[PDB]
Amino acid sequence: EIILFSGSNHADFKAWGGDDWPSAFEISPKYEPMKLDLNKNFEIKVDYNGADIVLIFARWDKDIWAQISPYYVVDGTAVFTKEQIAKAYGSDDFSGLDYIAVKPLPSEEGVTVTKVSGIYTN
Numbered sequence: 001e002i003i004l005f006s007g008s009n010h011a012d013f014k015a016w017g018g019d020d021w022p023s024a025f026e027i028s029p030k031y032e033p034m035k036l037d038l039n040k041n042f043e044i045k046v047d048y049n050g051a052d053i054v055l056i057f058a059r060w061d062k063d064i065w066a067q068i069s070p071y072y073v074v075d076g077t078a079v080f081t082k083e084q085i086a087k088a089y090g091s092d093d094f095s096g097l098d099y100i101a102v103k104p105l106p107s108e109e110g111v112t113v114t115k116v117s118g119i120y121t122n
């Protein structure tokens with residue numbers, strides 16, 4: 001396991017159509033370091049409470065916005081697989097990738113995220 005975040009980030013988000021869709025967690029891998037190696041086979045797990053969430057990968061210059069629903073949710077932990085991300089992204093090659101974020105879908109009380117990690121698979 002590789003920990004990308006633990007703590008408690010809250011994000012509020014009532015509706016699309018406004019100016020800001022905020023992240024409960026996000027990183028910009030062109031600038032910020034991360035131990036997670038996207039060329040290996042991986043899963044991303046997020047511990048959370050509240051609104052349903054999506055995982056986003058985005059590349060600003062191909063206009064790519066891969067947006068993924070959890071593979072499953074048990075015990076307040078969401079799981080996202082490489083295979084899912086790839087399918088949404090168009091490809092399993094992530095060179096050029098600009099943006100990874102965990103975002104809530106529209107709701108009244110928002111979402112709280114306590115942990116974000118990645119796991120390597122065989």
Ligand SMILES: OC[C@H]1O[C@@H](O)[C@H](O)[C@@H](O)[C@@H]1O[C@@H]1O[C@H](CO[C@H]2OC[C@@H](O)[C@H](O)[C@H]2O)[C@@H](O[C@@H]2O[C@H](CO[C@H]3OC[C@@H](O)[C@H](O)[C@H]3O)[C@@H](O[C@@H]3O[C@H](CO[C@H]4OC[C@@H](O)[C@H](O)[C@H]4O)[C@@H](O)[C@H](O)[C@H]3O)[C@H](O)[C@H]2O)[C@H](O)[C@H]1O
Pocket residue numbers: 016017018019020021022060064065067
């Ligand atoms: O190159 C610009 C890029 O540079 C960065 O520096 C900047 O930080 C980025 O913000 C910016 O990219 C633009 O980001 C916004 C969202 O920005 C948020 O996330 C990134 C953060 O950096 C920033 O701080 C945040 O505020 C994008 O707009 C959002 O796009 C998504 C996804 O949809 C877009 O891409 C996929 C394509 O298929 C779509 O056609 C395209 O719009 C939207 O999410 C979708 O929302 C709809 C419902 O909303 C729609 O219907 C209702 C209407 O009122 C609303 O206006 C409509 O959009 C859902 O059905 C989908 O499920 C969901 O995916 C967001 O709504 C939209 O705000 C820019 O597109 C991106 O260029």
